[PDB]
Design a protein around this ligand. Structure first.
Ligand SMILES: Nc1ncnc2c1ncn2[C@@H]1O[C@H](COP(=O)(O)OP(=O)(O)O)[C@@H](O)[C@H]1O
Ligand SMILES: Nc1ncnc2c1ncn2[C@@H]1O[C@H](COP(=O)(O)OP(=O)(O)O)[C@@H](O)[C@H]1O
Ligand SMILES: Nc1ncnc2c1ncn2[C@@H]1O[C@H](COP(=O)(O)OP(=O)(O)O)[C@@H](O)[C@H]1O
Ligand SMILES: [Mg+2]
Ligand SMILES: [Mg+2]
Ligand SMILES: [Mg+2]
Lengths: 526, 526, 526
């Protein structure tokens, strides 16, 4: 293969550690309320600014291949943490560096870095246990706004708007975030099944106010094929006029004689029908019509395999919806009736799809957004006066959103970094099997102090004074680095979801403890 | 051809030896419980970490073409050893270096390196003989877990889970290894004939609990062609309703009027049929349907075999299975009856297939899991917090698995490196034909000491002290380098499969003794 | 054309001589039992190891274009020798260098290198004459194993296995060599029947890689008459093929409706039939089909004669073959089963026929009947623990094979190099026409000593002492360089085929004597 060059021992370790230390030093300035931003040059456009640890970490590759190895491993840590939790990234980075340094330094000739790894892993298991003991599950929706506001670097309006969206959509509902054109944030809430297709004919309109067709207690007909009929349409109308209900028809297109029947029966006798095009993109529309089928209760006509033909309809083959509103541009269906088991089955199917499907043909979320919650879906239109600002703010809101979900699903624990600090006594009551494992437990024991001391160091104060003052003080009190003084943590609102504190530590220790086991590194020649 | 440059004698030998020594020095740090890991840069991704001798060895090519020649030969050793046995690789490398150095040094004018090679090979035959004498075939299922745990670098949970899988699937059954998404290891066991295809219609469902089609004592119909027409489907249903058994139908597709008959006859007069698509990949599906055919006892219709049409079936042309379970995603058959002679014939055919074919279109293994699944198969899903960790652990698990199969199929012998040390007296009772052969036997005699001394050296202790203390000690005793003291080897569980110990030595000596014969080296100019 | 650069006289001669001397020096270390190997870098893979003079010679091109000219001419010599004889390559190289050096040195102003060439060629003719006088044709099959073992560099097992194969296949039978997977050598002997007739239709093809019909455990149908028949047999034998085996059909011709049924049943439901014309000419084909009948076990149909009729077949009336392969031009059958007693009876009939028949048209066919019957070819599956070892051993085996064939077809003469040494007195009784020719004869006279002194020099001994000791000694005695002492040559088994000794010398002198004629060299600019 490619010509290569190899390096042995603490010499090479010092290089990889140089890379780790560089990347960590770049990431760590963002940490906490008094943290600061990092500008990253973009190849094509104007530069990004970010406070996100992981986005800083991924941006830094290094010319020196060994230092680049270290860097790649640390950004591996920050990326794993961001994927598994969505916050706690800077923390995972500084933790990873601390474990890597304290690891590397303690190795000698007699030492056994694999066994030391075993010891640190023991120590982190023991720590996350005590973390779970410390966890108190979220209750009041004030705590939601607190977790959000703290994860958004002190922006109260962010955690307010997130609290509102999460209230109006539900704690495990769908919230998504995108750019506003407005200079301020907006919360929009959509309920139903909305998609961007409008009535084929103006003649379908019911209300002269808004120019909408508005229906309630309506039927739905779903056709995967065109309806140029053939009059495969008529039984579907006879069946509708029979039970005196309005009928909405969704199809690849509805035209030829079909449309003529539709707008003749609409304009003369006062029949209640609308026809709209399928959401429409090839193989995607098939999946969408199957979604609306499953949600509204009923079945899709045309070719899947077993073909259900339009001539032979039954009322149980249609669909049933609480309300429907259609305009020139878009169609919304509301309160559709079907098996809730079958719909949640469907959502469980699409999430497990998108999760494996590294495709970035992300309309699968547009599907997931469509097959609607419980209580609905929320769009977060972020404002600001400039694109770079918008990207910063949106990074922070995405962080706060992921943080709130982690909080509701696992728990909340003390902020500052105190949650990791309080776990040290749990390490003090450990029973190491040998010197190596003891070294590991010592490494974790030192490493736990780091996040709090770093948040304080960014404040411009003597962080390691503050860590020890916190340790001498009671369990409920910690350091408010923004206000610059000690306070009750949970009372003052400074709190972190337990899931992020767990995942940051687990990932960081997980990769760094493996890094410390290295004795020889092999790299490509420039 | 290409312009070239040539070198003569001990100078070139010293260069090639420099290459050998470099690569060997890189691989050898991994050896034993106190061994250490090697990081290797990947071109596209984050770097690999490994304790695997072969993956270290293959990763190192060298700029100096002569040193690269040495390196390539050593990679030949490690790769041959990994292919033929799957462990014992680091050992094969250090052995190969020892034979190469001790070989090169002993060369002079009057000397005859070919004959020295002959003496070395004599010595290797003589040692592996005594190794086979030392071998004690495995008995208790504690010993498998011991061999696994030692081959997995001291991870007891690995050898436990391997012991469990090997118990529940059998000692020569199929175990396979893959990534978990879970942070922990999992053992899953599949029984039957599973494949990833589901019922064509929901209407086939019978149990409503899980939403499965569940059958017992069922028939199987196998069609390699599509089944649209009624005419070729109906008699197969008449014969099924006749003998009052459920019928599962596997086909390229079930589609036209056939399907309509199927779910109509399903929904009324409660007939018990299910239909599923063929596992489905062109020429692969043919082989799969033939597998399921012979396994369930019976024949495939639509084949280029053949002379058999779907209209003329007989109950002896179908299939017979103890139980069947089908879902939206997958289909499982469990206790199908057919000639065990004929199915083991089939498995004997596929192993002899895959063994010849180097094309990594590993569906041939996907076949092997399926038709061997009527004993069972185990998937070992390895956990961890990060991909690099997962690749390391999985490397170790694959090592331990190959080691356990080598142990059950050939035998077990003393671990540490003692098994080779104990064979030295067998060399002492040899009768060399001439000085050259005597030099060879001396080379092997020195070389046997190496693996134990290296495992001790990695521990941070005086390895060659330990070798002599072991040699002075009794046959049953060796050095526990992890515990850092001497012990009964077999009692303490430190044992190596004989197959890896024979194959490492045989390969290493095999190429290195050839390397020592060189007098002139010819290389391309840069 | 391309810009060029030219050089004049003994300067350019000295450069070309530098190239010759380099390549020769690289090749010459391989010579004899105490010779040594040459490693050659491969561009794509792991390096080659070899003892083959020609493969060393072809591997060496040179940057200096003049030296490269010399090198190209010497590898021309080694390649010509390898093509024409298959051994004796290093010998041809050292001979060529000796003639080139001794040639170049003797050139002056008054000298006429063309005439010197004439003298050299005279000397070589005179030498090969006396060589042919010395040749004693091989008799005992011990001599075969001797020639093989010596040409295989002392591997007794090689010459044993070659002796066995040559006994069991015949001295002018087919032996071929290929890689084993076994760690040991294997002799396999296959028996077959090739003849020059191909499938009647392309539609019969069953491989797509190449254009063959390939079958294994097949049946054979033998018809002395044409098969143009309807379903009055073709199905009745096909119906016999119930218990599914592939079918080969050999007939005077197969056409009309028969063929249509054949390629209909072939093209629709993939039935396994092939049909080929009888080997075919008049009364000869009758005897041939009876031969194939007796060999494959079974009977000829259509024999009128009277008469087994084609309508009345039984499976015991067909034929049974381990394998059958072929394409458009020829037909090959492999491992046919029948009574070996009846086959040896048949061969005993053909020889006793052949011995007495008038006059010499029939015996040309009677030979072909014999050599198409009574067949085998030997496959030499070479073992070893690694690909490079296998390639080395295979080089040596192919060398020994070509050497044995040269020995059986031309003769054997003294080994060591003594066969050339004994020819010197024949040069002593020459009558040169002028000084130039005398220079040539002197050049050959010196050159003959070279191979023996070189084999001794590789041993580490004073080669030119040994040459003169041999010359002082009797004709039957020479130097055993492996045993390190003088012995009777033929008695100890050290012997070389006369053909290789002839061809090495003839080629070497042929090219080198032309090289010595050069006065101006013209080469491309870098
Ligand atoms: N006012 C504050 N006083 C003390 N600690 C704070 C305050 N605000 C935020 N923090 C701490 O800062 C940390 C969050 O830092 P952040 O920049 O979000 O890093 P990450 O992106 O890794 O989560 C939390 O652990 C939180 O406890
Ligand atoms: N606790 C232990 N004490 C002493 N020797 C050990 C111990 N564990 C493993 N060994 C020995 O060390 C060797 C491990 O080799 P390993 O590092 O797995 O590389 P490979 O198996 O690829 O050569 C085995 O031969 C084994 O006998
Ligand atoms: N034991 C031996 N004693 C003397 N000469 C030997 C012996 N074995 C082989 N030779 C000689 O070595 C010569 C060269 O053989 P080899 O090394 O295979 O190269 P080549 O390709 O020229 O045959 C042969 O002429 C043969 O007679
Ligand atoms: Mg944050
Ligand atoms: Mg191992
Ligand atoms: Mg030879």
């Amino acid at each position: 293969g490619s010509a290569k060059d190899v390096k042995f021992g603490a010499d090479a370790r010092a290089l990889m550690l140089q890379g780790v230390d560089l990347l960590a030093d770049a990431v760590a300035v963002t940490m906490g309320p008094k943290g600061r931003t990092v500008i990253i040059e973009q190849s094509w456009g104007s530069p990004k600014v970010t406070k996100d640890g992981v986005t800083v970490a991924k941006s830094i590759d290094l010319k020196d291949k060994y230092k680049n190895i270290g860097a790649k491993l640390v950004q591996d840590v920050a990326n794993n943490t961001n994927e598994e939790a969505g916050d706690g990234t800077t923390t995972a980075t500084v933790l990873a560096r601390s474990i890597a340094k304290e690891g590397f330094e303690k190795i000698s000739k007699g030492a056994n870095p694999v066994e030391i790894r075993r010891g640190v892993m023991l120590a982190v298991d023991a720590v996350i246990a005590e973390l779970k003991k410390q966890s108190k599950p979220v209750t009041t929706p004030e705590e939601i706004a607190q977790v959000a506001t703290i994860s958004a670097n002190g922006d109260k309006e962010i955690g307010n708007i997130i609290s509102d969206a999460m209230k109006k959509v539900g704690r495990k509902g769908v919230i998504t975030v995108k750019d506003g054109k407005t200079l301020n944030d907006e919360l929009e809430i959509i309920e139903g099944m909305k998609f961007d297709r409008g009535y084929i004919s103006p003649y379908f309109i019911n209300t002269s106010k808004g120019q909408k067709c508005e229906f309630q207690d309506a039927y739905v007909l779903l056709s995967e094929k065109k309806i140029s009929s053939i009059q495969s349409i008529v039984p579907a109308l006879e069946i509708a006029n029979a039970h005196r209900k309005p009928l909405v028809i969704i199809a690849e297109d509805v035209d030829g004689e079909a449309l003529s029947t539709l707008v003749l029966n609409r304009l003369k006798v006062g029949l209640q029908v609308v026809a709209v095009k399928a959401p429409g993109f090839g193989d995607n529309r098939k999946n969408q019509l199957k979604d609306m089928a499953i949600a509204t209760g009923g079945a899709v006509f045309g070719e899947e395999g077993l073909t259900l033909n339009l001539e032979d309809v039954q009322p149980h083959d249609l669909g049933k919806v609480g309300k429907v509103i259609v305009t020139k541009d878009d169609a919304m269906l509301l309160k559709g009736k079907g098996d809730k088991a079958q719909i949640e089955k469907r959502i469980q199917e699409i999430i497990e799809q998108l999760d494996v499907t590294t495709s970035e043909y992300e309309k699968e979320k547009l599907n997931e957004r469509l097959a609607k919650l419980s209580d609905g879906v929320a769009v977060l239109k972020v404002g600001g006066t400039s694109d770079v600002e918008v990207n910063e703010k949106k990074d922070r809101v995405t962080d706060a959103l992921n943080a709130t979900r982690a909080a509701v699903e696992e728990g909340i624990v003390l902020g500052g970094g105190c949650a990791l600090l309080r776990c040290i006594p749990a390490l003090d009551s450990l029973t190491p099997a040998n010197e190596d494992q003891k070294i590991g437990i010592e490494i974790i024991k030192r490493t736990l102090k780091i996040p709090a001391m770093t948040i304080a160091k960014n404040a411009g104060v003597e962080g390691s004074l503050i860590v020890e003052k916190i340790m001498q003080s009671s369990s409920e009190v910690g350091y408010d680095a923004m206000a610059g003084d000690f306070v009750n943590m949970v009372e003052k609102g400074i709190i972190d979801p337990t899931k992020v504190v767990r995942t940051a530590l687990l990932d960081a220790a997980g990769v760094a403890s493996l890094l410390t086991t290295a004795e020889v590194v092999v790299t490509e020649i420039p």
